[PDB]
Amino acid sequence: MVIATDDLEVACPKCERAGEIEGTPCPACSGKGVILTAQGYTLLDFIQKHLNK
Amino acid sequence: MVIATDDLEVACPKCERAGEIEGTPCPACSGKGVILTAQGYTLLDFIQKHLNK
Amino acid sequence: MVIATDDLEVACPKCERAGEIEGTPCPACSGKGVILTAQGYTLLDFIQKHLNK
Amino acid sequence: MVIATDDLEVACPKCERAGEIEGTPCPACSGKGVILTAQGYTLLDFIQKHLNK
Amino acid sequence: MVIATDDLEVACPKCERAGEIEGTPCPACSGKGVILTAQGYTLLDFIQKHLNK
Amino acid sequence: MVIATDDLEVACPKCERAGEIEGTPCPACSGKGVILTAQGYTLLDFIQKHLNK
Amino acid sequence: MVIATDDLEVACPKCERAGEIEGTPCPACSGKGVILTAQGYTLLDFIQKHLNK
Amino acid sequence: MVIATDDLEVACPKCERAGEIEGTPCPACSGKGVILTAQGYTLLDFIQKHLNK
Amino acid sequence: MVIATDDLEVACPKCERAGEIEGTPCPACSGKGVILTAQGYTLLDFIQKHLNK
Amino acid sequence: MVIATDDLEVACPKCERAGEIEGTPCPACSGKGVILTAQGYTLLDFIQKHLNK
Amino acid sequence: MVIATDDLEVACPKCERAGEIEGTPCPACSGKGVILTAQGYTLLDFIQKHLNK
Amino acid sequence: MVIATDDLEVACPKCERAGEIEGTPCPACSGKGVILTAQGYTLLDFIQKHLNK
Ligand SMILES: [Zn+2]
Ligand SMILES: [Zn+2]
Ligand SMILES: [Zn+2]
Ligand SMILES: [Zn+2]
Ligand SMILES: [Zn+2]
Numbered sequence: 001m002v003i004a005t006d007d008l009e010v011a012c013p014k015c016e017r018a019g020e021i022e023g024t025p026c027p028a029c030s031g032k033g034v035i036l037t038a039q040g041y042t043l044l045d046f047i048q049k050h051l052n053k
Numbered sequence: 054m055v056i057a058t059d060d061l062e063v064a065c066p067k068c069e070r071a072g073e074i075e076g077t078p079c080p081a082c083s084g085k086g087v088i089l090t091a092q093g094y095t096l097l098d099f100i101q102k103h104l105n106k
Numbered sequence: 107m108v109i110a111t112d113d114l115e116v117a118c119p120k121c122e123r124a125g126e127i128e129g130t131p132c133p134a135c136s137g138k139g140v141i142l143t144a145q146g147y148t149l150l151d152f153i154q155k156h157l158n159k
Numbered sequence: 160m161v162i163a164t165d166d167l168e169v170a171c172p173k174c175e176r177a178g179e180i181e182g183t184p185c186p187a188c189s190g191k192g193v194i195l196t197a198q199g200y201t202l203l204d205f206i207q208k209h210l211n212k
Numbered sequence: 213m214v215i216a217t218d219d220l221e222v223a224c225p226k227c228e229r230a231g232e233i234e235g236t237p238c239p240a241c242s243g244k245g246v247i248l249t250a251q252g253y254t255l256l257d258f259i260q261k262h263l264n265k
Numbered sequence: 266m267v268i269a270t271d272d273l274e275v276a277c278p279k280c281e282r283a284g285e286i287e288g289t290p291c292p293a294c295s296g297k298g299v300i301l302t303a304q305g306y307t308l309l310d311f312i313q314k315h316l317n318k
Numbered sequence: 319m320v321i322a323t324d325d326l327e328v329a330c331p332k333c334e335r336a337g338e339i340e341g342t343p344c345p346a347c348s349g350k351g352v353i354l355t356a357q358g359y360t361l362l363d364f365i366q367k368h369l370n371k
Numbered sequence: 372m373v374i375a376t377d378d379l380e381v382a383c384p385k386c387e388r389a390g391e392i393e394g395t396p397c398p399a400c401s402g403k404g405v406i407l408t409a410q411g412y413t414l415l416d417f418i419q420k421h422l423n424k
Numbered sequence: 425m426v427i428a429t430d431d432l433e434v435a436c437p438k439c440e441r442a443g444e445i446e447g448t449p450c451p452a453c454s455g456k457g458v459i460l461t462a463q464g465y466t467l468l469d470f471i472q473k474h475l476n477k
Numbered sequence: 478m479v480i481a482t483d484d485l486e487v488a489c490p491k492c493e494r495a496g497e498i499e500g501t502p503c504p505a506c507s508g509k510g511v512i513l514t515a516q517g518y519t520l521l522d523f524i525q526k527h528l529n530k
Numbered sequence: 531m532v533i534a535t536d537d538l539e540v541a542c543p544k545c546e547r548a549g550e551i552e553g554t555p556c557p558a559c560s561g562k563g564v565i566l567t568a569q570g571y572t573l574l575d576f577i578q579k580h581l582n583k
Numbered sequence: 584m585v586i587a588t589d590d591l592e593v594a595c596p597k598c599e600r601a602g603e604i605e606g607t608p609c610p611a612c613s614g615k616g617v618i619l620t621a622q623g624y625t626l627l628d629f630i631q632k633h634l635n636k
């Protein structure tokens with residue numbers, strides 16, 4: 001596998017994957033529990049700008 | 054090409070990509086004509102998760 | 107990384123990336139300001155084909 | 160790792176790796192429980208035609 | 213193979229590699245029928261720069 | 266290059282590459298201003314384990 | 319596909335994949351119609367060395 | 372070259388590639404003088420499972 | 425990911441990654457539990473040769 | 478090294494690198510002593526098509 | 531991008547691609563401003579050796 | 584081997600690997616006989632800034 005999940009996202013340091021810091025959704029990761037890598041951004045940006053257009 | 058179609062999907066070998074055998078949707082791939090790889094699921098899962106949020 | 111933006115899109119020659127011919131949607135890259143590569147088409151086809159499908 | 164098991168075999172969606180459907184060999188994957196990818200077929204073909212010749 | 217033709221040039225999508233639309237020189241590839249990728253420019257520029265010298 | 270700084274390090278979202286929040290050392294990345302990727306840890310752990318041993 | 323057939327075998331220049339010249343074994347590729355590359359040899363030797371051992 | 376011999380097996384530390392130790396096969400690499408890597412094991416497993424099937 | 429742990433280290437088959445055999449340092453991996461690949465030696469040697477010089 | 482000479486050229490089987498069979502140039506490798514791979518062909522074709530033209 | 535400029539040439543470290551230090555042709559790379567890698571020499575060699583010979 | 588020594592270090596043009604010019608220590612590569620690539624500095628800098636924390 002050329003590109004794996006850990007090529008695409010890093011586990012959030014702030015909320016350590018929980019998506020919420022003590023009741024409140026976590027601001028570092030937008031409630032995702034995960035932060036994008038350069039590679040993940042690259043892929044997501046491409047799809048977003050080209051998908052269905 | 055780092056990541057080709059054949060790295061994402063396997064042509065279902067029963068119906069040879071058709072999706073049907075003699076009219077009846079193929080009993081292996083079950084329509085899709087294609088079966089996803091670990092790598093294909095990774096990408097799709099990543100996008101499904103992060104797209105538009 | 108393994109696959110960058112430049113592996114996925116080329117800068118369109120007609121509009122030079124602006125996507126617009128002084129007001130009018132550029133007819134070459136169809137507004138995008140960019141043209142997809144084999145690799146970019148592969149990714150985008152896969153995602154459109156299987157996303158939420 | 161360059162080329163993983165998942166790059167070579169996909170799990171069979173009919174029998175989910177069991178190789179059998181209610182006693183009899185699974186007709187999708189032909190009893191193997193697994194379906195080869197283009198990459199897998201490539202390696203195997205090469206070996207089959209050249210090994211011990 | 214590591215570097216294929218499709219990694220080096222894009223089929224000009226406007227004319228399907230003809231370089232001409234309805235008698236007219238196609239504006240998206242400039243008659244060439246093909247647009248160079250970042251990768252293709254790199255190799256070509258590198259050979260341009262160092263070959264015979 | 267096959268492995269760039271951004272393949273190894275991600276920018277710290279909490280401190281924005283500063284390493285400090287209001288003077289006190291930043292808790293999320295523990296002083297660095299940067300969070301390591303799976304690839305970054307793979308590399309770093311290998312080196313720490315075998316270096317000068 | 320990280321390693322293709324053409325990464326493994328080259329088409330024979332003497333017999334263009336036929337394996338015989340005039341009816342007699344083709345002395346260039348010794349009947350095979352194909353020549354192994356360094357990569358092909360590597361895989362073949364590895365497998366021949368370890369298989370069933 | 373995508374996958375080398377050294378990607379597939381490591382030189383045994385006890386017998387430095389020779390198969391024997393003072394006469395009898397080496398207690399570590401069991402005669403082979405080499406130790407398989409994750410990658411080499413993967414290939415060999417795959418071939419043993421599907422070859423002549 | 426481009427370079428994984430198993431691309432750098434091989435799990436020692438004489439001691440199952442433990443390091444010690446029946447209390448004594450293992451003759452294969454020399455107590456480490458792990459044997460380095462050519463890839464792993466190349467990184468290590470590069471770092472030990474250039475680090476802090 | 479991503480692509481080596483062995484990935485580009487194979488040794489000629491008829492002349493075994495000599496480029497000459499009994500005084501007269503080798504009709505197989507046209508005297509070069511070497512045969513191109515698909516990768517070598519694609520690289521060479523690209524450069525010839527685009528080099529300062 | 532499989533093979534980048536940086537993979538082919540190194541910026542001469544004393545002059546920073548300038549080719550000159552204070553008017554005088556740079557002693558280190560003496561002119562080019564750049565030093566070829568093994569990878570760069572391999573492609574260049576190949577092209578020089580095979581281009582319309 | 585994804586990343587070899589020749590992807591990290593380049594032979595110094597001035598001292599041709601010897602690190603020395605007629606006794607006088609080489610100023611191009613400051614004694615080392617080798618110049619680092621962009622890839623080589625990436626890894627060395629990453630290791631230097633994170634090692635021992
Ligand atoms: Zn979070
Ligand atoms: Zn089917
Ligand atoms: Zn345009
Ligand atoms: Zn099945
Ligand atoms: Zn066109």
Ligand SMILES: [Zn+2]
Pocket residue numbers: 277278279280281282283284285291292293294295296297298299
């Ligand atoms: Zn921080």
Ligand SMILES: [Zn+2]
Pocket residue numbers: 330331332333334337338344345346347348349351352
């Ligand atoms: Zn032949």
Ligand SMILES: [Zn+2]
Pocket residue numbers: 383384385386387397398399400401402404405
């Ligand atoms: Zn041994």
Ligand SMILES: [Zn+2]
Pocket residue numbers: 436437438439440441443450451452453454455457458
């Ligand atoms: Zn051990």
Ligand SMILES: [Zn+2]
Pocket residue numbers: 489490491492493494496497503504505506507508509510511
């Ligand atoms: Zn010849």
Ligand SMILES: [Zn+2]
Pocket residue numbers: 542543544545546547549550556557558559560561563564
């Ligand atoms: Zn210089």
Ligand SMILES: [Zn+2]
Pocket residue numbers: 595596597598599600602603609610611612613614615616617
């Ligand atoms: Zn020097």
